[PDB]
Symmetry: D2
Subunit: 410 residues, 4 copies
C-alpha cells in the first residue's frame, strides 16, 4: 500500500566516520529555497558568486573555478577525461584506497597508468615522486592529498615545483582534506583540484567543486568539441581528439559557466544553493581559522584515544586533522563496538575496508562536527562501550587528557 510510505524521517545521528558527516543547518535550510529558471538573472548571478567564493576556498585566482554536478569522484573523472587522451602517460602515487580509484578512472580513460607505492599508512617523499617523474615522463601527476582510508595527508608543497621542471600537469584529489587542512592551489603550482561536499564542507554529497589553471584550461581547449544539438556555424574543434564523454567534457562545462552560457545541461539549482552556502560559511569564519579548528579537535581526540590505552594507525606526523585511525584492542569485535555506538548512542564511527577490516576504526572530526562537544561525546561513548564489552581503561584518563588539551590550547 502507498499509505505506508510516510514523510521523510531519518533518525538523529552524530556522524564521526570518514564521511558523509552531518550537514551544517544553514546549508540544509538553503536547500529548501524555491527555484528559478536556468537563465534567470539571479541564477547566472548565483553561478558567478559560486566561482568567486570557491576561488577563496581553493586559494586560487583561476578564472575556471566551478561545480561538477555529481559526487566527488565525478569531479575526478571530469578532470581526468578532459586531460587524458587515450595513450597518455599518467603517474599515480598510491598511498591508499583512493590512489587505486585514480588508477581505475585513468584506465577507463585509456591512459598508460604508471604507479609508485608506499605501504598503508605512510606517505611519499618529494624525491620519490621526482625519481618517478624522471623515469616515466608523465603528462599528469595524479595525487590524492588526504586519503580517508589511511588517514594520511600527502605533503603537496614541494611537488608543484617538481612538476613545472619536467612539464607535468599537477592534479590532486582534495575531497577529504579541503576546509580542514591547508591547500594552497596557486602557491603550490596545482593545475587541477577536485573536491567534495560531505567531508569538511558540510555538505551533503552530490556536488564536486573543481578549479583549473590557465595551463590546464589550454589542454582542454585543444580538445574542444561542442555537442551537436547546441553546435552553431561559429563553433570549431580543437587540434586534438575529443573528450570521450558529453557529460564530463569540461570544455563545454566551462562554456556554460562562461559569458557564452552554452546550454550543456540544467544546473542543479538546489545543490548550487547548498554549495554556495558551504563556501560562504567557510569564508565568514575564515579558512585559516577553519583549519585551526579542525587541528584543535583532531588532536584532542588523539590525546583522548591515547589515554584510553589505544594504539593509533599510520605516521602521525602526516595525519589529517579530521581523521584518526584507532587500532582495535583485540579480543574485541569491531562490528560490535560499531553497532553499539550507533544503535545505543546515535554515533556512527567508520569501519576500515580490505587490508584493515576488523583491525582499525576511523573516527572523523569534520566541518560542522569539528567541535568540542562532538569529540567529547564520542570519547565518552567509545569508552563506555569498551568497558561494557570488558576492555579495562584507567577511569577518567581518556577524558582528562581531552580536557587537558582543550585547557592548555586556550
Amino acid at each position: 500500500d502507498i499509505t505506508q510510505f510516510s514523510q521523510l524521517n531519518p533518525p538523529s545521528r552524530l556522524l564521526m566516520g570518514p564521511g558523509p558527516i552531518n550537514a551544517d543547518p544553514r546549508v540544509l535550510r538553503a536547500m529548501s529555497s524555491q527555484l528559478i529558471g536556468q537563465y534567470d538573472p539571479a541564477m547566472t548571478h548565483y553561478m558567478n558568486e559560486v566561482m568567486a567564493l570557491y576561488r577563496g576556498v581553493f586559494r586560487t585566482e583561476n578564472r575556471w573555478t566551478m561545480l561538477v554536478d555529481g559526487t566527488s569522484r565525478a569531479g575526478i573523472e571530469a578532470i581526468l577525461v578532459s586531460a587524458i587522451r587515450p595513450g597518455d602517460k599518467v603517474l599515480v602515487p598510491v598511498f591508499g584506497r583512493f590512489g587505486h580509484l585514480l588508477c581505475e578512472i585513468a584506465r577507463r580513460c585509456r591512459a598508460e597508468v604508471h604507479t609508485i607505492e608506499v605501504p598503508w599508512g605512510e606517505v611519499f617523499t618529494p624525491d620519490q615522486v621526482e625519481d618517478a617523474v624522471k623515469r616515466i615522463r608523465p603528462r599528469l601527476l595524479l595525487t590524492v592529498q588526504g586519503d580517508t582510508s589511511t588517514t594520511m595527508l600527502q605533503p603537496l608543497a614541494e611537488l608543484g615545483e617538481i612538476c613545472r621542471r619536467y612539464d607535468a600537469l599537477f592534479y590532486t584529489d582534495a575531497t577529504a582534506s579541503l576546509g580542514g587542512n591547508p591547500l594552497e592551489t596557486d602557491v603550490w603550482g596545482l593545475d587541477a583540484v577536485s573536491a567534495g561536499m560531505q567531508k569538511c564542507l558540510g555538505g551533503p554529497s552530490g556536488t564536486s567543486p573543481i578549479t583549473l589553471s590557465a595551463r590546464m584550461e589550454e589542454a582542454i581547449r585543444r580538445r574542444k568539441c561542442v555537442e551537436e544539438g547546441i553546435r552553431t556555424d561559429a563553433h570549431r574543434d580543437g587540434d586534438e581528439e575529443m573528450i570521450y564523454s558529453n557529460y564530463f567534457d569540461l570544455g563545454m562545462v566551462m562554456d556554460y559557466w562562461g559569458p557564452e552560457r552554452l546550454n550543456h545541461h540544467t544546473e542543479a539549482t538546489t545543490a548550487l544553493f547548498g554549495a554556495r552556502e558551504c563556501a560562504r560559511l567557510i569564508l565568514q569564519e575564515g579558512l585559516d581559522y577553519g583549519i585551526a579548528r579542525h587541528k584543535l579537535h583532531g588532536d584532542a581526540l588523539v590525546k583522548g584515544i591515547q589515554a584510553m590505552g589505544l594504539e593509533t594507525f599510520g605516521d602521525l606526523k602526516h595525519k589529517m586533522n579530521n581523521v584518526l585511525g584507532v587500532v582495535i584492542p583485540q579480543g574485541i569485535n569491531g562490528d560490535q563496538a560499531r553497532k553499539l555506538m550507533l544503535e545505543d548512542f546515535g554515533i556512527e564511527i567508520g569501519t576500515s575496508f580490505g587490508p584493515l577490516h576488523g583491525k582499525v576504526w576511523r573516527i572523523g572530526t569534520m566541518g560542522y562536527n569539528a567541535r568540542k562537544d562532538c569529540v567529547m561525546t564520542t570519547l565518552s561513548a567509545l569508552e563506555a562501550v569498551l568497558n561494557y564489552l570488558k576492555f579495562p581503561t584507567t577511569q577518567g584518563a581518556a577524558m582528562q587528557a581531552a580536557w587537558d588539551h582543550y585547557r592548555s590550547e586556550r
Copy 2:
C-alpha cells in the same frame, strides 16, 4: 568583501517555460531534512523504497529501477555508455534538439550512429522506423518520447514489438514526459528508460531516475570489471570488454543499489530524499489522475492561446500534454515579451533555440505548475503584455475559452 555575500534569496517566480519548473513545496522541505551515514539501515531502507516507488512511476516490475546521481543527460549517458560497446551500431530517429543529444552521447560512446529525420515539429510512424531497422540493423533503438524543443510526443506503443521482432534494444528518454504523458515501460517493451526531476516530477535538476529490463542488465553484466580499490578475490570479469567510465558503470551502480552494497560512490543523501518525495507524491495522487490533470490544464492553455488569436506550432494530435509552442505573430518582439513577462509579472515563458529562435515561445504546464491558477495567470499576463505591445486581441476572448473548458470538464 565576504559581507557583501548574503543569505540565499531568489525572487518569487512562476516557471512556465520548458523547464526547470517550480518544485513541489513538499519536495523542498524533505531536502532540509537531516542526513544519515552511507550505510545506515535507514539509508538502505530509503534506497529500497525509492526503487519500489519508481517501479510504480515507470510502470514496471524491473528489479533494476534506481537513481543516477547527475542531471537528466547523465542518466542517459550512464545507460548508453553501459549498453554500447565501441563500434556497435545505433539508430536515432531525430525529431528535435534532444534527438541530436542522443547522437552525440552515442558518438562519445564510440558508436556508429545512424539517423532518420522528420521536420520540426512532426513525429515518426511505426512503419518509418521499421524500414530503418530493417535497413541498418542497429543493436539499439534510441528514442526521445517528449522532445521539449518541438513540444512533440513520439508514440512508442507499437515500436516495442518492432524492436522485439528484429531483436533490437529499445531505449527512451522520457525526462520531459514522465508523469505528464503515458509511459508503460513493460507493456510497451522498453529495455531502458531514463528521466529527470525538473519537468513533471517537481523537481530540481541533479538526479536521473532509470529503469533497466532483465535483457538490459544481462547485457551490462557481460561488461563486468570491478574497481581496483573496492575489488576483492570474489570479483571476476565479464566476457565482453569493460565500460569506459567508472562513475557511469551501471554494473557497479547495480551492485551498490542491490543486496551487496558495493561501495561505488556516496549516494546523494538530500537528492535521494527529493527523488523519494516526487515519486511518493505522484503515486499518492495516482499516475492516471496525474496524467489526466496534465492533459486538462494543457488543453485549457491551448484553447486559451487559440482564442487570443495566436497560432500554435507543431502537429497538435501528438503534442505533449505539458508543453505548447506559441508563434510570435511578427511585429511583436519575442525577447521583449519574455522580458516583460519575467520582470513585470514574475513569470518565465520559454524561448526557442536554433531554427525556431525568434519564432516560437514554449509555454509549459508541468508538475506543481499544472494547475488552473497557473494557466489563468499565464494567459492573463500574456494577453496584457501583448496588448501593451499594441497587439490587438478580442477583449476577454482568451480568458473566456479557458473558463468554458473548465466548465465543460466538470
Copy 3:
C-alpha cells in the same frame, strides 16, 4: 477516524492581497524551521537582546524596553492596556473604523471608563478635534489606531503627541497594520506605547506582537509591580498601586524576563522569536526609509490601475494607507463571486469588507513581501479578467497602461 487521511502539511499556493495575513518572506519561514535551544542558553538570551536592539530601529525609538509579546497583534494591545489601565481610569478613543471599536472593548474589559469620539468611514481626525476631546474628558490615555485596515485610512499622529504632553495624557498607538509600510516616528512623535503585528508589512506569520514602551510608561507599569507567587522571592516587593489584573499580560514581569534579572515569567516562543528576529533584520537591511517608499510606489501603482479600470475608491485618498486600497464593488456585480473567482481560479486572495461595508467594497492589500511590482500587475489583470467575464465593461488595456506608465515615470 482515521490516521491515514491526515497527511503531510500541504497548503495551496496563494498570493495574499487581502487585509491580512499576507505572504511571509521565505527567509522568515526558513528561520522558523531552525532547531531550538534551552530557555536560558547564552545563545537564546543573546538573540532576545538582538530582538530588542533590532526593534528599536523598526519602531524608530531609543526605548530600552522594546520587546515581544507572545500572542497575536491584539494580545500586545491587551498587554499594554491591561498594564496601563487601573479600573476607573479614564480613556479616550478616536474611532474612525472597525479597529477603533476593538480598542473600546479591550479598554472596557480592563474596567476603564471609555470615552470615544467619531468621524465617519473613511475620514480621519483633526488635531483640534482630539484636543477638544482631551480638554473635555481629561483622559489618562489617548488610544489610537494608526492605520485601520477596515477603512484603509491612516491617522496623522505627528501633531497628536504634543497635545498629550500639554494635558498629561499617555499616548498609545496600534500600528500592527502600518509599521514597515508607513512612517512611524515613535520617539519623535512622543509615543508612550506602540504595538505591532507580524502578518502585515513585516512578513510575518501572525502570533507575535512587538511592543515598545517609553521611559514614562515603564514608570506607570512598575507602580503596579507584583511578582507571581511561584517565582517570587523575599527581595521582591509590590508597587504602590493595584496589581495588573492578568498574569500573562502583566508587562512588568515580561520586562523583568527580558531584563538582566531574567525572571522566569513564561517560556518565550523560540520559533516565533526566530521569525520576528528575521522580519526586523530584513527590514533594516533594505532600510526602513526604502521599505516605506516601496509600499508607496506599488500602492500608488495599484490605485492608478484601478482608476483606469473605471472603478471607484473608498474614503479620503489624502490620508490613505500605503499598503491597502478600498475598491467600490460596481453594481450589480457580486463581490463574493469575484472573490470566489479570484481565489479558486487565479490563486489570488482579495479582501471583503466586514460590517456596514459588506458587498460594497473590496480591500486589496500590497503589503510587505507582496509589496512588489509583479504582485500589483497580476492582481490587476486577474481582476479585469474576472470583471469582464462577469460582463462589466472596461477599456481594453487601460488598467495595465496606467500602471506601466506609473512604473516608467517613477524609474
Copy 4:
C-alpha cells in the same frame, strides 16, 4: 550596524532539562511551509483537523477542543478567566511551583483562592482533596497533573467522581504530562484541560491545546459578550457578567473555531501547522505506545542514576515518566556540572529553582528526546563530568544498569 546581525544559527543542543526540549524535525519542517488567508477553505479545514486530532490526544469527544495562541500558561489563564467570575471560590491543591501559578492566575481573575499543601515532592490523596471540597465548597478544582519542579505526578482518576459528587468543575494543567503520561479526560470526569507544546508534544512553545467539557461551555456561554467591532443585531449578552478579557474570552474563541467563524483574532498560521503535526505524529505512533516509550527511557535513566551512586528526589511511586530529580552530591558544584555539560558536551540538564536550587538537578526524557540514545549520551556525559570533578563511581556500573534494563525489556 546591521551587517553584524547574521542569519539564524543556534548551536546544536541536546535538551534534557525540564523544558523546552528539542523539537521533532517533522514539526520544524511543517513550520517552514507558506501561509494561506485566515478564512481560506484550506485554513478552516486544517483547523477542523486540529480539533479532531487533539480530541484523540486528550482522550475526549469534546467538541470544544482547540488552541490558544500563546504559551502554556496563556491557555490556563484563558480557562480560568472564562470560568471564574469575581468572588467565585477556587481550591488549588499545591504540590510544587506550578500549584502557585494557578493561585496567582485565579487571584488576577478576582477569585477567592483556597489552598491545601503537601511538601515537595509528595502527592495528594483523594481523601485530602475531598475533605477540602466539603470544607470550602469550591466552584473550581485547580490541579497540576505533572509538576516538573518536583517531578511528581498527581493521580486524577478518583478526583473526577469527587468533583461530580460535590458539584465542582474540575480543571487540570497537563502541559508537562500530556503525551508522556496517561490522561483520560472523559473517563476522569474532567471539565477543562490545557497543555503546551514544548514538553512531550515537540513542540516549540507558543500554542496551548485546550479542551472544554459540555458542562464548561454552558458556564462560558452564560458569560457571553461579543466584541463591538464583530457584533451584529443577531447577538445578545448572556445572563452572567462578562469575561474580563478580550483575547482570552473563550466564548468568542469557540465562535472563531465554530461554524460562524467569528473574527476574534488572526489564528497563528505557522504554529497551527506545528500543533497539527505534533498531534498527528503522536497519534501515528499511537498515544498508548508513546506513553509506554516515555516510561521505558524514564525508567532506564533512573536505574543508571541509581547505579551511579546518586540519590533521587521525591516519592518514586508517583514520579513523572519524563522527568527525574537528581540530588546533587556534597562538594560537587551543581551549577558547574551544568556549565561543563552544556559547553563541553552540548547537553542541557535542568537546574532547580526555589527550595531545591543548588540541591537537585532536573533531567528530562521527553518527546523527541525520549529515545535510547539521548538516555545513554546523558548518562555517560554526567558520569564523565562528575568523575573529572573528583567524584568516585564504580566504573561501568551506571551504563551497565541502563544496558541491562534495555536488554531485559527487549
